[PDB]
């Protein structure tokens, strides 16, 4: 699970390689959150679409609590 | 941004494919599942880039050394 024939982890890896290549003595101190934003957003979007906006169902599918789910939606301004 | 196509698009695709293979199946840990698939390569690439220096890796990531160690242990990288 989490394929795009090639696993999702391989794409992440590739994206990081490309990014590192663009650094050139340029600092970075928010990599974790930067990658996270890139991933959480589409994840939330997709789950919501899947459950047709039902937050309870979306949270149960993700294994997080409803409150945390709403907190993440807010964080990304997804309401 | 992160480009492989922005990484976010790769994430979308993987989820579509995941969903398609659901067929009335039960899912209760999608968050953890996706997170693991992303955190592992992240930690790996970072460690290589900083040549194995944990502090440098922590600084780059914006987290503290302890959190980094916890995640590393978590994926059996440490």
UniProtKB/Swiss-Prot annotation, chain B:
<dbReference type="GO" id="GO:0051276">
    <property type="term" value="P:chromosome organization"/>
</dbReference>
<protein>
    <recommendedName>
        <fullName>DNA-binding protein Fis</fullName>
    </recommendedName>
</protein>
<keyword id="KW-0963">Cytoplasm</keyword>
<comment type="subunit">
    <text>Homodimer.</text>
</comment>
<dbReference type="InterPro" id="IPR009057">
    <property type="entry name" value="Homeodomain-like_sf"/>
</dbReference>
<dbReference type="Pfam" id="PF02954">
    <property type="entry name" value="HTH_8"/>
</dbReference>
<dbReference type="GO" id="GO:0005829">
    <property type="term" value="C:cytosol"/>
</dbReference>
<dbReference type="GO" id="GO:0001217">
    <property type="term" value="F:DNA-binding transcription repressor activity"/>
</dbReference>
<keyword id="KW-0238">DNA-binding</keyword>
<keyword id="KW-0010">Activator</keyword>
<keyword id="KW-0805">Transcription regulation</keyword>
<dbReference type="GO" id="GO:0042803">
    <property type="term" value="F:protein homodimerization activity"/>
</dbReference>
<dbReference type="GO" id="GO:0032359">
    <property type="term" value="P:provirus excision"/>
</dbReference>
<dbReference type="GO" id="GO:0003677">
    <property type="term" value="F:DNA binding"/>
</dbReference>
<dbReference type="GO" id="GO:0000786">
    <property type="term" value="C:nucleosome"/>
</dbReference>
<feature type="DNA-binding region" description="H-T-H motif">
    <location>
        <begin position="54"/>
        <end position="73"/>
    </location>
</feature>
<comment type="similarity">
    <text>Belongs to the transcriptional regulatory Fis family.</text>
</comment>
<dbReference type="GO" id="GO:0009314">
    <property type="term" value="P:response to radiation"/>
</dbReference>
<dbReference type="GO" id="GO:0006351">
    <property type="term" value="P:DNA-templated transcription"/>
</dbReference>
<dbReference type="InterPro" id="IPR005412">
    <property type="entry name" value="Fis_DNA-bd"/>
</dbReference>
<dbReference type="GO" id="GO:0001216">
    <property type="term" value="F:DNA-binding transcription activator activity"/>
</dbReference>
<dbReference type="InterPro" id="IPR002197">
    <property type="entry name" value="HTH_Fis"/>
</dbReference>
<dbReference type="GO" id="GO:0031421">
    <property type="term" value="C:invertasome"/>
</dbReference>
<dbReference type="GO" id="GO:0032993">
    <property type="term" value="C:protein-DNA complex"/>
</dbReference>
<keyword id="KW-0804">Transcription</keyword>
<dbReference type="GO" id="GO:0006355">
    <property type="term" value="P:regulation of DNA-templated transcription"/>
</dbReference>
<dbReference type="GO" id="GO:0000976">
    <property type="term" value="F:transcription cis-regulatory region binding"/>
</dbReference>
<dbReference type="GO" id="GO:0043565">
    <property type="term" value="F:sequence-specific DNA binding"/>
</dbReference>
<feature type="region of interest" description="Required for the stimulation of HIN-mediated recombination">
    <location>
        <begin position="5"/>
        <end position="24"/>
    </location>
</feature>
<dbReference type="GO" id="GO:0001046">
    <property type="term" value="F:core promoter sequence-specific DNA binding"/>
</dbReference>
<dbReference type="GO" id="GO:0045911">
    <property type="term" value="P:positive regulation of DNA recombination"/>
</dbReference>
<dbReference type="GO" id="GO:0009295">
    <property type="term" value="C:nucleoid"/>
</dbReference>
<dbReference type="GO" id="GO:0044374">
    <property type="term" value="F:sequence-specific DNA binding, bending"/>
</dbReference>
<dbReference type="InterPro" id="IPR050207">
    <property type="entry name" value="Trans_regulatory_Fis"/>
</dbReference>
<comment type="function">
    <text>Activates ribosomal RNA transcription, as well other genes. Plays a direct role in upstream activation of rRNA promoters. Binds to a recombinational enhancer sequence that is required to stimulate hin-mediated DNA inversion. Prevents initiation of DNA replication from oriC. Binds to hundreds of transcriptionally active and inactive AT-rich sites, approximately half its binding sites are in non-coding DNA, which only accounts for about 10% of the genome.</text>
</comment>
